[PDB]
Structure 1
Amino acid sequence: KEVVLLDFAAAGGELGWLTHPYGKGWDLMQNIMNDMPIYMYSVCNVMSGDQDNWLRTNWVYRGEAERIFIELKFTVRDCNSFPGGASSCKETFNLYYAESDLDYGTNFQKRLFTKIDTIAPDEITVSSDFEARHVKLNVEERSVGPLTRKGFYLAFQDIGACVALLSVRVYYKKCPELLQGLAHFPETIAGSDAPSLATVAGTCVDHAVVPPEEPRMHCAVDGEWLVPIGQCLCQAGYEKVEDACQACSPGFFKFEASESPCLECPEHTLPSPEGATSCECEEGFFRAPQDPASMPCTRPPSAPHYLTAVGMGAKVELRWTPPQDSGGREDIVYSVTCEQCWPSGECGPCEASVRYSEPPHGLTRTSVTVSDLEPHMNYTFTVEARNGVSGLVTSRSFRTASVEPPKVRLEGRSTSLSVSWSIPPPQQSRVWKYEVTYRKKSNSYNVRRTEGFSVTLDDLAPDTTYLVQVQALTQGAGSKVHEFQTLS
């Protein structure tokens, strides 16, 4: 943006500039142009030989100006258009300037002034331009710097030309007040040196902050802000609306300082007030200290839907399933505990002699093997399900599970094998059917079924070892493998 220090055309002819020599050179003329009253300094001593006429402007307070720009508007008359026209006619005039600490007033010494440049017209005014009322107004601009003293003059030297000065405009350039990157940059003065890049620190607008680079701009000599470094961010609870930061709307939130808008409240949450960093949880639900506020409120899971405790051999196998209700979480872990009971009646916690095929806590698997158990003892295993928000409630979600084969003998043989078995009468009600399996002593065996307690394996090979097992089926428990040999 340009700050004007001098504007002749705007002064309405009230400036009264100093001329030299006294009342000989430039004159203040007045005319009408564009139906408007205008003033101008003009001189046309084209017949008088060696001319040296000076027009000095009033003392101009420099202020903070380093490089000033001088805009001249003027006309120059064709040297050919003079009935007489001595070879002393010129078509240029000179632009001078002088720095000063104080106003010399009526004092004028030429050799104080330094020449800036020769001013020449792009358009010459010809004689025909005269009966046609045609004004050819030239525009010329120069610049000088660095200005260093309190003030300065401008001076115009005529050397024998036909000129009229319509406008004189002096100004310096000012990098405009700036709102960018959510920061504020004051109006600063364009330096004088061409390679001038003044670093201007910015101020974070209200409710803005620098999170981790601090905002900076660079003012050039032409008044342009060049290279932006860093920025201010709409911090938590705030977002970017147009050129500033605004509090999050009701029902929205923002947890960090980012260039993202406010996220609307997730599921199972309570409507938020303005400028919320996170939405509060709905009754009965929670969030973990690692959950993003975009994640819906969750809760502890239900118990493992199913749990089976089978005593295959001497070890017991625990096989379970994920809860019907996960509480809307995916970080579910399991933990197993044990109680002992002597069918004595007395009970107590599991002994330290019981081992697990896997550390009984922090389980992600849905099964574990328990070994080293005392016989006949009634073991009750409880498997608990826990997710990320379990530590925020006292309740527990778990499921419990507590942990005679046929005695078989040969009643005869031939070549075939006549087999019989037995189980205590109290158990006889439980068995639906008995399953007899017989293989030859790798992938092909034969199985029959009976509700009775004896079967005769038929169609067998002579002098042969067979693997016979009898399992008690229920709506179970199988015997050990027996080796029975046929006759010869």
Structure 2
Amino acid sequence: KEVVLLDFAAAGGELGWLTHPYGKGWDLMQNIMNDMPIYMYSVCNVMSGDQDNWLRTNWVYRGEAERIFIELKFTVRDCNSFPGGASSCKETFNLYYAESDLDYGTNFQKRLFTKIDTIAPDEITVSSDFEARHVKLNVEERSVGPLTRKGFYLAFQDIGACVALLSVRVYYKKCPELLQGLAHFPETIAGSDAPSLATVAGTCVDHAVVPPEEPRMHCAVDGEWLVPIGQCLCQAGYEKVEDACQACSPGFFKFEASESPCLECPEHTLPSPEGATSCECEEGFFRAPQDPASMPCTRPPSAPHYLTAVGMGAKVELRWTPPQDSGGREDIVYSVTCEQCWPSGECGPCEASVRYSEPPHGLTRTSVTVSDLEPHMNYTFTVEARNGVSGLVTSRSFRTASVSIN
């Protein structure tokens, strides 16, 4: 976006800038064009030889601007299309400028100016663009920086030429206020040097922030933004929408700080309210200390579906099928126990005197082999299916069988 300090063009010709010397130089004409009324500031002392015709714009208040952009529109007439033709004429005039801290009114001072460029035409109005009434108009442009003082002046020099100032237009440059990826960036002003990169701290919209990288933006001299460094993420319980950050729908969630949307509630889980961090668990289901809240609601494992104990030789081979309801998990650990109901009658748990071919508790297999045994005993055995959520439970789940050897 641009911000204007001046537009003689659209001032309906009521500005009237100081001329010099005292009205013998530059002059203001009206005239029809495209049927609408237009005014110009023209001079044409091609003949009078020794010139120095200034025309000095009012007083432009600086404002925020540091490099201002001047944009003159104008027709210049050719030097051979003059009949008298006194060839001291030209088609180059001069743009100037003054920093001041106080409108010097109609006090004027040439020396006080420095010069920008010597503007010249990209199209001369020649003796023919007249007969037809052809309007050979020039758009030329320039600018200058950087501007320290309160307020400044333009002003033009004529050394004898047939010029005619159609538009003066002054404006400067700021980079649009911006939402770009969950950070908010000001509207903020370009600047004087040519590789001048405005560094602008962004700020994180409602609901979002920085993981470690900072949100930052780069604003150029042409009033453009440039090197997106960083971003902001829709925080714990919220999902990015458009350039907003809308809460998580009826029955969804977003646990951490992620570029990712709202994952819909898992299984065994109660239709969460508006914007829920982790999904609410159902009565009769659980989660572990090293669990993700994505990894749905589970329960301890039903007992081995099938139990047997092949008394193969002297060593009993134990063989059992895996649970019919895993508790929706895949982390089950079989723990096995023993006994000694002797007939006699006195019952009483085993003796470690017996030997196996694998450790007792936590078994990722479905079988072992118990050697080191005592022939004749209602050798009671019981295996157990336990997972990870099998501690939020005193209520056990196991399956048992018995054997005697010879």
| TM bucket, shorter chain | over 0.9
Contact 2:374–2:405 under 8 Å retained in 1: no
Question: 1:198, CA displacement in angstroms?
Answer: 1.9
1:309-343, CA deviations, whole angstroms, 9 ceiling, x for partnerless residues? 24445543322110122122111110011222222
Cα distance between partner residues in 2 of 1:191 and 1:381: 86
What is the CA-CA distance between 1:175 and the residue it aligns to? 1.1
Distance in 2 (alpha carbons) for counterparts of 1:333 and 1:349: 22
Deviations 1:387-420 (A, max 9, x none): 232222332111111xxxxxxxxxxxxxxxxxxx
Deviation at 1:290, TM superposition (A): 4.2
Match in the other structure for 1:239:
239
Contact 2:375 2:405 in 1 (8 A): no
SS in 2 for 1:241: coil
CA shift for structure 1 position 381: 1.5
Task: String of CA shifts for 1:410-438, please: whole Å, max 9, x gaps.
Answer: xxxxxxxxxxxxxxxxxxxxxxxxxxxxx
Structure 1 residue 238 displacement after superposition: 1.5
Does the 8 A contact of 2:376 with 2:405 survive in 1? Answer: no
1:162 aligned residue? 162
Question: Cα offset for 1:177?
Answer: 0.7
User: How much has 1:234 moved relative to structure 2?
Assistant: 1.2
SS in 1 for 2:153: strand
Point out the structure with the larger strand share: 1
Task: Give the C-alpha shift of residue 139 in structure 1.
Answer: 0.3
Could you say if the C-alpha distance between residues 343 and 270 of structure 1 is closer, same or farther in structure 2, counting changes exceeding 3 Å? same
Give unmatched runs, 5+ long, in structure 1.
402-485
CA RMSD of aligned residues (A): 3.5
CA positional deviation for 1:68: 1.1
1:366 Cα shift? 0.8
Distance 2:7 2:68 in 1: 13
**Which 10-residue stretch deviates more, 219-228 or 255-264?**
255-264
From the superposition, tell whether residues 344 and 54 of structure 1 become closer, same or farther in structure 2 (CA, over 3 Å). same
- Count, aligned residues: 404
Cross-structure match for 2:273: 273
Give CA deviations for 1:338-379 in whole Å, capped at 9, x if unaligned.
222222322233334344422211211111233434443433
Identity of aligned residues (%): 99
Q: Deviations over 1:39-91 (max 9, x none)?
A: 22111111211111101111222222121111000111122222212111111
Question: How far apart are residue 195 of structure 1 and its match?
Answer: 1.7
C-alpha deviations, 1:251-310, integer Å up to 9, x for none?
222222222221222233221222122322334223334444444432222111112224
CA contact (8 A) 2:278 2:293 kept: yes
Q: Measure the CA separation in 1 of the matches of 2:282 and 2:36.
A: 76
Moved more, 278-287 or 82-91: 278-287
Determine the C-alpha separation between the residues in 1 that align with 2:195 and 2:311.
89
What 5-or-longer segments of structure 2 have no aligned partner? none
Determine the C-alpha separation between the residues in 2 that align with 1:251 and 1:324.
30
- Deviation, 1:245, is 0.9
Q: 1:3-35 deviations in whole A, cap 9, x for unaligned?
A: 111111122222221111111111122222222
Larger mean CA deviation between 190-199 and 345-354 belongs to 345-354
Q: Could you tell me whether the CA contact under 8 Å between 2:311 and 2:405 is conserved in 1?
A: no
Task: Determine helix, strand or coil for the equivalent of 1:302.
Answer: coil
Q: Distance in 1 between matches of 2:137 and 2:393?
A: 89
Q: Distance in 2 between matches of 1:261 and 1:138?
A: 55
Aligned-partner Cα distance in 2 for 1:335–1:277: 36
Deviation at 1:487, TM superposition (A): 35
Q: Is the 8 A contact 2:71 2:142 kept in 1?
A: yes
Deviates more, 1:41-50 or 1:302-311: 302-311
Alignment map for 1:473-484 (pairs within 5 Å): none
Distance 2:188 2:92 in 1: 37
Residue 61 of structure 2 contacts residue 150 of structure 2 at CA under 8 Å; is this kept in 1? yes
Higher relative contact order (CA 8 A, sep 6+): 2
Question: Which stretch has the larger CA shift, 154-163 or 30-39?
Answer: 30-39
**Aligned partners of 2:405, 2:3: CA distance in 1, in Å?**
126
